[PDB]
Design a protein around this ligand. Sequence first.
Ligand SMILES: [Mg+2]
Ligand SMILES: [Mg+2]
Lengths: 346, 346
Amino acid sequence: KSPEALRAMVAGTLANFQHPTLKHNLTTLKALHHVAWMDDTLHVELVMPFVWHSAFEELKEQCSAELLRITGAKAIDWKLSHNIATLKRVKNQPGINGVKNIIAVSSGKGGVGKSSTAVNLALALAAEGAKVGILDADIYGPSIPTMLGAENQRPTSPDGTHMAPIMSHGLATNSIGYLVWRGPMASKALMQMLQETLWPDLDYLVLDMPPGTGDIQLTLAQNIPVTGAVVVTTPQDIALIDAKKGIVMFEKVEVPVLGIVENMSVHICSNCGHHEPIFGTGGAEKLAEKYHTQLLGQMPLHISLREDLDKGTPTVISRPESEFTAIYRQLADRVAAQLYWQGEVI
Amino acid sequence: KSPEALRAMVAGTLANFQHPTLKHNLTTLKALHHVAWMDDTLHVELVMPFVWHSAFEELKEQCSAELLRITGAKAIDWKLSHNIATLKRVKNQPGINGVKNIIAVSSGKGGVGKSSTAVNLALALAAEGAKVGILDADIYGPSIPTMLGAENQRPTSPDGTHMAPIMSHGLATNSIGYLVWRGPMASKALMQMLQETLWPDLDYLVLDMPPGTGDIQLTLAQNIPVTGAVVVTTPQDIALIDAKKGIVMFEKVEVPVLGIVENMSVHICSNCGHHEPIFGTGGAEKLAEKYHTQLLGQMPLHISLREDLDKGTPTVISRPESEFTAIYRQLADRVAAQLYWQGEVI
Ligand SMILES: [Mg+2]
Ligand SMILES: [Mg+2]
């Protein structure tokens, strides 16, 4: 078991593992950090530039069979780390202090679950192994502090000018609702809240944007160093048209569109367990390839998800072992990988 | 059986019939047109100032028992007529030529089924016994001609300047989509389409408005002789907030708000038959009394209703004997009665 021959065997095995989060195989990512041989057990330490906790489990169950087969180990001791990479933005627009990446979440009008996707994406990204925050920028409907229960709280001012973020459910949070308003005036107060908030070491910062593609939304996509955008829609035709507009809006500002999330794809009868595409099917998939982007994931419509939206504890935290949390965790892996595969590391 | 004693007995019986469409009993409406006695059968002819076909059936089954009891008739020969009354509008804003009343249908943003309610209200109003048309004014999403199949058709110009309406499913129809656009320019072309269209003897004219409460929507509620408005919402909180805005918008223009229609109140599993309030419950009822107006009706969310919206034949025509059509027919009676009980006849 030569340590250089061990690395060659391990890297030669990980090079075949395929996954929706892997545009190219793992050897592309230089992730193979360490390969050792202690007490007849083969140690493999992997350091990914984006979150990969759930996908890392699939790698273990698929490759350990052959990894034990070519090596001579009683077992394999895996280990997953994360050094989240800061991706370069267009025009080198100065990024936010303490914020590596900014994943924007936008939609067209309400009723699509944009804000529901924002809180759970942020919690899933943190659950997948990153330092995550979330800025509620939805001026029309500041609903993030309510979804987290931090509605009755207010941020403190350590620097007098700067604001200390509310650490809700482990996320560094702040909201425009803590200050309540249309036109360029709303964009200014929303902007400086991003600068004046003392974000910690946020590898990711989910930005719940105001819905629509007006001048105030476009002003946000211009002056905010958005690393990537995630458009949210329902299989309804009226929502897909708005998603078509949002993708166009972000493209015309050179902000990378990570993909589309199809909320309320099907409804799950709480008694029958039957899945009913009450709003259509495949409409989001059609828009994904029509604009050369991915369909990052789908999310059903279920009564338990709406109930979690009223109790002030999002589903990723309330039901950490549910299918819905497992879907949100997959979305985080799918999103953070797409944020990486599109750009270049700094 | 003195004919004056017959009328007293009939009017004294109809004076007790109670119904959600009757703010005051039938004797208020002077509707008792004729009471006769031919071949031992009692004839009763009723002429209502608003549509009442479905409610007229309830009057027959409830009152014929006692009507035969106080009279001496082998049976009762009912007869329902309609002389739809033109209600006076605020500031005496000159009404549209050939259009007695204008029932506006508005909402906040899309996904609430505003346009689905508009076509079926118009068809139900006609099914309930009136001459009805419908003008698609939704500039953002002209979806009425598609819902009727008259999408590929275009109006003809009899007077060169004036337009002949497309007689789709017996309705006098016209759409802004036949011309395709924001700002005061959109309000002008939309306005003159209402004047230049040669509406026949439209007792009612459903106006499918653009969603929202912006300046262009408010300009429409000002310059159009709207006799009444019907706000559409879903039990979602985001839609109810928009309904709260629309009611306020119409009130500040002295346009009577007829009430609220709660679309997608519950979802009906096509297998379980189970009703699931996926978007909440009672939110629309709360807004109704908070603004001193009626809850004109509720409408479930079912796959067959969405399918009727793609096949180009609305549910009132496609499934004339379904529960959903029976609900739309009740809504017409509820709406047209509310349009009457609020104002004064010309
Ligand atoms: Mg919101
Ligand atoms: Mg429409």
